[PDB]
Design a protein around this ligand. Structure first.
Ligand SMILES: Nc1ncnc2c1ncn2[C@@H]1O[C@H](COP(=O)(O)CP(=O)(O)OP(=O)(O)O)[C@@H](O)[C@H]1O
Ligand SMILES: Nc1ncnc2c1ncn2[C@@H]1O[C@H](COP(=O)(O)CP(=O)(O)OP(=O)(O)O)[C@@H](O)[C@H]1O
Ligand SMILES: [Mn+2]
Ligand SMILES: [Mn+2]
Lengths: 176, 176
């Protein structure tokens, strides 16, 4: 379900979890992972070299699913690739050797559902509240156009409205 | 078997493969991989940033074992860390995003054996000949001299003499 170099996404603040969950129930959404605590360590060079290029690099641990990912996001906000990793500390030390060191951490509760080709990701962050992201994976930049708007069609059928859209990343929201 | 941020290693030209193999049987070596094709893609930044720090970074595929490794050697002597990865192409693209691109590729045939704490590799490189590496990984910097001396003793035991020692790396031997 996670194949491709691009994650076409639309993110929204969620005003009621009840109606969101009813729609998930309505549309026969498949649960992939539910209520995982996700801890994301963001790494950068000592002069913020990656952020100066619109790139984020993260080591993510998700519990209790046990999933560990190395993620490189950017440049831009569709480009995203990740790799499952066995050992977060081994990868972190290897990256430190290359000059990347922890810069900050973002924690969240996350659930991920599927409806056909769409991912619906439901997040809760301590300060900030509830969010949902509609996303579609692709490997072909030559098809990015259709997908977004389609995340918009799906989001339109889903009760996630423009007035609630949130274009900022979590690092942007948190001042990192 | 492959635990540590330090790797003590001695590489030898092999003048007599028959003696080496006969000693592998006599010493009850266990084969970890036999006659694998190993393709190593060396990666660096456009300005050779890693080489300038005596760091090498490799994505290795070994067939038919199916082992895939991301390896960061250095900076300088005796430092090496590796992680298993599921997909070379995927990590390669991730590293390309960070600015590291294929600089050159080395191919070889390699068998890897264990005798107690020691690793013995038997390599053949088409333009160059037959080599064997004797190696021990550790996290402890205080024993590196002892371990290297143990490797040299161990090697003599396979008919690999002090005078067949090869301090140059394959990348150096191949003009990279
Ligand atoms: N279990 C899994 N296996 C493989 N890849 C996965 C995965 N779970 C997620 N991914 C991939 O890794 C990417 C991670 O990106 P996101 O989770 O969207 C960052 P985020 O925390 O939402 O922050 P942002 O809004 O601040 O950018 C996903 O787009 C997806 O492609
Ligand atoms: N299956 C595995 N799991 C984890 N680590 C491994 C592994 N196989 C090998 N490694 C580690 O990664 C290192 C890779 O380095 P080498 O294979 O020595 C590069 P090389 O091709 O020999 O050229 P060189 O001449 O520069 O040494 C190994 O020495 C080993 O310590
Ligand atoms: Mn996201
Ligand atoms: Mn070697």
């Amino acid at each position: 379900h996670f194949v491709g170099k691009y994650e076409v996404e639309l993110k929204f603040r969620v005003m009621d979890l009840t109606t969101l969950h009813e729609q998930l129930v309505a549309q026969k959404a498949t649960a992939f992972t539910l209520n995982n605590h996700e801890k994301d360590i963001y790494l950068d060079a000592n002069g913020q070299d990656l952020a100066k290029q619109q790139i984020s690099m993260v080591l993510r641990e998700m519990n209790p699913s046990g999933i560990r990912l190395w993620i490189v996001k950017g440049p831009g906000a569709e480009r995203c690739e990740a790799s499952n990793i066995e050992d977060v500390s081994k990868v972190q030390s290897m990256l430190a050797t290359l000059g990347y060191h922890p810069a900050f951490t973002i924690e969240k509760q996350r659930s991920i559902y599927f409806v056909g080709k769409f991912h619906i990701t439901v997040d809760h962050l301590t300060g900030l509240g509830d969010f949902a992201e509609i996303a579609i994976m692709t490997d072909d930049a030559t098809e990015l156009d259709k997908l977004k708007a389609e995340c918009r069609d799906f989001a339109n059928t889903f009760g996630l409205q423009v007035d609630q859209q949130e274009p900022r990343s979590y690092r942007q929201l948190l001042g990192f």
